[PDB]
Ligand binder design. Structure first.
Ligand SMILES: CCCCCCCCCCCCC/C=C/[C@H](O)[C@H](N)CO
Ligand SMILES: CCCCCCCCCCCCC/C=C/[C@H](O)[C@H](N)CO
Lengths: 235, 232, 232, 235
């Protein structure tokens, strides 16, 4: 009949190909769909959802309910930071297992701005200021308030607003960063310090707990789907 | 906005073929595995299961691809001619084979694929065959309710989160060829590719190893690793 | 002007498929090479490397072709059935196989090719997957900078002209078939063809043998041959 | 389905074929390009760039910085030539390793006019005339000025202009010459002689050095891509 030439690649099965195949059950009356609430059209929609961060991962606190709580206090050392973590939304232990990190660990490349929401869960009689800073990579990780001050930062008054949104804008040499620990696509650092203090009156708890949430912004995007390392199966 | 999200779409997220089953079929002189029946599901493997369980409800047309790999078993110089494998779909209710030469293999109305070894992997497509309007990865309920008037507790006893015992049937795989004087052992790997996927009610991903067809957890319940509070 | 330059174009200059890797995969009774992981790069060979290093920056869509050649190893009369080879792409971050039957071979989201021996060489295409706006054949810098506050010199120590440790991942090649009673050894040769090539900042070609992934030179540093000054 | 006939050549892999292949990473958002300076659209663009010639390839001078310098002097023998080399832009040792020759050694055929630029790097108080001659093949290679005079030639006054451009036009029996030593596609000869002398005053260096550069003209073209012999790999 029609002369044809078999090109290289014939008789191969590529798991990512998109070819038409015969139907094993022809003329099947599939059940029609209904308007079920909560339809998802993109996986980045899930990443845009804020989810709590396991900020505290000490030996006696990780893999519990205490790993999501960061202790603030009026007796704390105002010179030392409250919490510190690298801006690696897929490899950092505190961000890897978040919903954002879970979605990222299925992709090789990511690019976009992040959004960290910190919620103060103390008494209404407790007041204070917290300095939340993002430092782009290249310099020493801020070990002091005088250093973190120099980078991007926001001051958060506990008494006025119980939640603060620190948005980390997309600033990268490369158009896409890797979802794996790489010093060439390093994203930066996030640090927290006591701007003034936590002040509480008498008959009030002098120690409180804050929670952290991470989310992706509308500019966020991922690339090169891959297999996650989180789930394993005994063979 | 110039960076796109074409690869993060639900269709792209499931556009890869995931292995869901490995089935061993042996041809030898007729305790034996001359025909193997495998119940259809994605829960025999964790990767595709975890990807699907990102959501509560799904509706997708499936694409199955069968990769058959044959080998000899202690052959000295015994050899075999090219084999043909029969993969017959048995939906719930249809009779099931009791032997490799049973009448059920006639495939009068059960769809079947005859695959010749050494050829391309056998690929077919299935539409959405769900009884309901969408697949239910999670079912917070039972199929039977124990009533006060039940004679015994076993009448209404049902597995938790189990909807139907025979979800979608089985695949019976045999070697159509008669037994050569030397044994030949083959592995059929089934790769499942969702297509035209629609999902509803997103869920957090599984954080601990799967233990059975449900949400049960038994071991390795400490996923997060040690890290300093103020360590970058 | 009637003589044309259609063959000197950048697209035509790279329009040939160059071998970039030879990978040995053995099937035998399970110190062994039942699965082989090869890191993706063109620097394992000199020809295509030299052609690409004619320029400083490049942007091209790649085409990979796999040629598999199998042979017996000391077989007396032990024989094997036609084998199927799995070539799985593992990008940076994805789990890597620790055995030939590991769960990672499920290829739930990692693209994979199942090639049947004796068929046409397995060919696929890849787009420009560069993080930056163009590939960097030469990178005059490091990835880490040693700072005054670093506890030790190893914190900031990085290889010169090395951008990322895991550039683009690896290819893991295995034989899906179980072990036949006789060993079978196969060589997979990967041929890389740039397409839609764009190049920037031309550079002089390499004049001495390559020594490693960089511009380092060790031996044979006297390329030019003897010739008389006034000898035609 | 459609009856087809498998033609000869099926299931073959030709490394020079142009066939469509399945994409292993579908729906990939490739990084957009930018306007990087120095874009190259043809390989002959590189050949058109003048590059220095290893004119001197003596045993004690080759593979050094002295192999690019040709010594001129007032005490030189005015009867003997300064330098002489065949017009083989890909096989001649002095031209093979030039950028032009490097590009040619990737092709089997070449055709076009060449351009040799000779730069005088002496004192501004040094003056002289140099006869640069091209002799088409067929006759004796010019061993004297009286012979080289008869072929194409140009006189170059060192005092006035420090650089001279000797253009060798395309004159060939065949439409294309081979990039390999072949007496049938021989290109000719290039020779240099002292037209008058180099004259220098007192307190001036009596010995100077000249440099040579070779380039291709806009009419230049190459054909039948091949593998270069310059680069080798131990197997
Ligand atoms: C030889 C022809 C083979 C025909 C194969 C037809 C099998 C039909 C099965 C279709 C659906 C199986 C997988 C999808 C259902 C999921 O498990 C749902 N989440 C059910 O809980
Ligand atoms: C089974 C499917 C195979 C999928 C293979 C995807 C591999 C992706 C690698 C693409 C680029 C590799 C070669 C090009 C990059 C060059 O080395 C650059 N000059 C980097 O320095």
């Amino acid at each position: 009949g029609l002369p044809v030439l078999n090109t290289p690649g014939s008789n191969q099965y590529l798991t990512s190909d998109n070819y038409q195949s015969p139907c094993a059950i022809p003329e099947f009356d599939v059940t029609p769909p209904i308007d079920i609430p909560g339809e998802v059209k993109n996986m980045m929609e899930l990443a845009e959802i804020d989810t709590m961060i396991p900020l505290n991962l000490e030996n006696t606190k990780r893999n519990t309910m205490d790993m999501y709580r960061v202790t603030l206090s009026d007796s704390a050392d105002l010179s030392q930071p409250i919490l510190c973590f690298s801006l690696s939304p897929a490899s950092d232990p505190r961000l890897s297992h978040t919903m954002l990190g879970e979605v990222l660990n299925y992709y090789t490349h990511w690019a976009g701005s992040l959004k960290f929401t910190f919620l103060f869960c103390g008494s209404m009689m407790a007041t204070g200021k917290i300095l939340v800073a993002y430092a782009p990579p290249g310099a020493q990780p801020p070990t002091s308030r005088k250093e973190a001050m120099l980078g991007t930062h926001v001051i958060w008054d506990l008494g006025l607003q119980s939640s603060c949104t620190m948005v980390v804008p997309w600033i990268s040499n490369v158009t896409y960063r890797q979802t794996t620990q790489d010093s060439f696509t390093e994203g930066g650092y996030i640090s927290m310090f006591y701007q003034t203090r936590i002040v509480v009156p008498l008959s009030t708890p002098k120690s409180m707990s804050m929670l952290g949430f991470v989310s992706a912004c509308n500019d966020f995007s991922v690339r090169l789907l891959r297999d996650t390392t989180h789930i394993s199966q005994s063979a | 906005q110039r960076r796109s999200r074409s690869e993060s779409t639900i269709e792209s997220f499931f556009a890869r073929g995931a292995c869901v089953a490995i089935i061993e079929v042996d041809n030898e002189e007729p305790a034996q595995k001359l025909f193997a029946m495998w119940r259809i599901t994605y829960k025999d493997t964790v990767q595709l299961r975890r990807k699907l369980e990102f959501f509560t409800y799904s509706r997708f047309d499936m694409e199955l691809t069968f990769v058959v790999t044959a080998n000899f078993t202690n052959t000295n110089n015994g050899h075999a001619l090219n084999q043909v494998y029969q993969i017959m779909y048995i939906p719930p209710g249809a009779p099931t084979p009791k032997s490799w030469d049973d009448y059920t293999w006639q495939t009068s109305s059960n769809p079947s694929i005859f695959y010749t070894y050494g050829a391309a992997p056998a690929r077919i497509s299935v539409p959405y065959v769900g009884l309901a309007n969408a697949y239910s990865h999670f079912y917070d309920g039972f199929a039977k309710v124990p009533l006060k008037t039940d004679a015994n507790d076993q009448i209404g006893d049902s597995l938790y989160s189990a909807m139907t015992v025979d979800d979608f049937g089985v695949l019976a795989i045999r070697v159509v060829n008669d037994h050569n004087p030397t044994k030949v052992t083959s592995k059929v790997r089934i790769y499942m590719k969702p297509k035209h996927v629609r999902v509803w009610c997103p869920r957090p991903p599984r954080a601990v190893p799967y233990y059975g067809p449900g949400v049960d957890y038994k071991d390795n319940l400490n996923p997060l690793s040690e890290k300093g509070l103020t360590t970058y």
